[PDB]
Ligand binder design. Structure first.
Ligand SMILES: Nc1ncnc2c1ncn2[C@@H]1O[C@H](COP(=O)(O)OP(=O)(O)OP(O)(O)=S)[C@@H](O)[C@H]1O
Ligand SMILES: Nc1ncnc2c1ncn2[C@@H]1O[C@H](COP(=O)(O)OP(=O)(O)O)[C@@H](O)[C@H]1O
Ligand SMILES: CC[C@H](C)[C@H](N)C(=O)O
Ligand SMILES: CC[C@H](C)[C@H](N)C(=O)O
Ligand SMILES: [Mg+2]
Lengths: 296, 296
């Protein structure tokens, strides 16, 4: 009586889509197994010592409990987690565990819940463990492709599948940003011109996806002047890296609250761009747009 | 040596699309004819003695000069303008003549310019008449359907054709709002939460158009908390009407800077909503999405 699932990392914000946009990655990913156990308790194991095992501290245990409670399920569960990336790297590591667990509980106990609801449950994990019920990383983890969190009370997620090829390159610095360090730096106010610029460019990115225009998508993605300039200073060599890959990528920006960098390399320069990245950051991986949590 | 064309009214902003979104109307429309005259003169003849016939003032003249100049047509022109609707109402009356003028000059004088180019030149008209080059009313007038001005110098416009029926009701209050003051009382900065709400809701509207979802389009359109709550105070009964037609329209918002109001009535209530709008204001127009300037 168990299910095993692959829950992917995700890149949020994408420049002008701050707190709205999310892109699902194929890799890295967590591998999560959930087993129904008679002992009405929640047991968790993780292969990353720096991550809690306390069912009330580990995001997977927080999600599992809320769902077992809401559905008055009898069994308890043993969750075994094999982490894809460290926390604080801006690749939605916590979201992968939250979305993966919601999806796994739904499969294991045949709850037949729609994706939006799995995103909502997963969001609780992000809350209890970050004070904010943010869903811009768990929405793409569940839906796959590109998502937009367009409302919170009640949650609304709009999904745009990506059926064309989009090569992704992710550089992962050896530093960490806890998503609390993440928001303090955030400006409290924005100028009207910036609001107008980000709305226009974010809308242009949506148009670009429907018209499968990667140059347009990438160019507008790099137009944010409200947050990116601030956060970029927290990443060693980030502006130098952008400059150096300038004409070989459709676009490059910070993934989530950072420090990881996400680039969309032009087809003819993918190796060159991957080496430039790896030259500053050894932990560089090549991937593409993913499909969301799936049974394995 | 002359051409006849209709230059339609347009509605900019559409709530969260402030300074970016533009929707072309079918009616009202200016009716313009232009004759090529040897005498190097700009003969502007416009009804409604309230529009400056002075080729220096009238936007149709400016677009003529700044244009004729370039292409060195080495002539002058007889511009007959039948106004479609009043100015200062928030329906792009200026844009109608500016863009209408440009599209004719093109067709008539051999020229093979681009729609973007026509939007480009037409902008100089709005420059001297309002202040800035404003392209959000001129773009839909020329492209038809729905447009997004995503950048200035270089001017960038993204067009999304509306291929489904979208009924529109326009109400014109017999008051005048000082377009310019309707600017200075606008906030100069906004909270992060509003940048987030507006980006998400505006992106959701583009998604709604591609999914031909009028209800999602109209609901998100009414979600602006930055500009509309302030501007709407100046439009008598606006908030009361919005609440009263609430379940009978996909959405209703201010057209441009006002005082005109644009509503997207549900098929089942179009007459009833048009009547409610007539009982509060006197002038209402039932129309649909237009396809832009075209040979009469
Ligand atoms: N061909 C023309 N049609 C209409 N108004 C004109 C024209 N040429 C010049 N104008 C002048 O330009 C002004 C009208 O532009 P606005 O006050 O901005 O109104 P509007 O264009 O209807 O509304 P907006 O800006 O799109 S909300 C008036 O002061 C007019 O006298
Ligand atoms: N299963 C889990 N996987 C990853 N991080 C987890 C998990 N359970 C709890 N966490 C905790 O939540 C935080 C991670 O959130 P944050 O710093 O924003 O990074 P992330 O982007 O990976 O969510 C850490 O304090 C971490 O130990
Ligand atoms: C977890 C927080 C998320 C990534 C948010 N969009 C931010 O950048 O802070
Ligand atoms: C027609 C709309 C104009 C250009 C501007 N968005 C305003 O509301 O003042
Ligand atoms: Mg105008």
């Amino acid at each position: 009586m168990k299910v095993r699932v692959k829950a992917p990392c995700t890149s949020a914000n994408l420049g002008v889509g701050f707190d709205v946009f999310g892109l699902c990655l194929k890799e890295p990913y967590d591998v999560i197994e959930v087993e129904a156990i008679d002992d009405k308790e929640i047991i968790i194991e993780v292969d990353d010592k720096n991550i809690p095992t306390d069912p009330d501290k580990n995001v997977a245990g927080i999600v599992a409990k809320k769902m077992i409670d809401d559905f008055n399920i009898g069994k308890g569960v043993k969750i075994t987690i094999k982490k894809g990336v460290k926390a604080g790297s801006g690749l939605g590591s916590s979201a992968a565990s939250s979305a993966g667990t919601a999806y796994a509980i739904n499969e294991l106990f045949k709850l037949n819940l729609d994706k939006l609801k799995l995103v909502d449950y997963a969001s609780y994990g992000e809350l209890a463990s970050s004070g904010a019920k943010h869903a811009d990383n768990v929405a793409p983890a569940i839906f796959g492709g590109f998502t937009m969190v367009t409302n919170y009370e009640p949650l609304e997620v709009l999904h745009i599948p990506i059926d064309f090829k989009l090569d992704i390159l992710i550089a992962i610095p050896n530093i960490s940003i806890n998503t609390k360090e993440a928001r303090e730096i955030l400006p409290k106010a924005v100028g009207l011109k910036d609001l107008v610029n980000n709305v226009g460019k974010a809308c242009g990115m949506v148009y670009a996806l429907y018209n499968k225009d990667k140059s347009l998508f990438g160019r507008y993605m790099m137009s944010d002047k409200v947050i990116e300039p601030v956060r970029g200073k927290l990443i060693p060599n980030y502006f130098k890296i952008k400059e150096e890959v300038k004409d070989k990528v459709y676009g490059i920006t910070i993934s989530g609250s950072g420090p990881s960098i996400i680039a969309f390399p032009k087809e003819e320069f993918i190796d060159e761009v991957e080496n430039i990245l790896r030259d500053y950051y050894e932990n560089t991986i090549r991937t593409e747009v993913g499909k969301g949590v799936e049974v394995v």
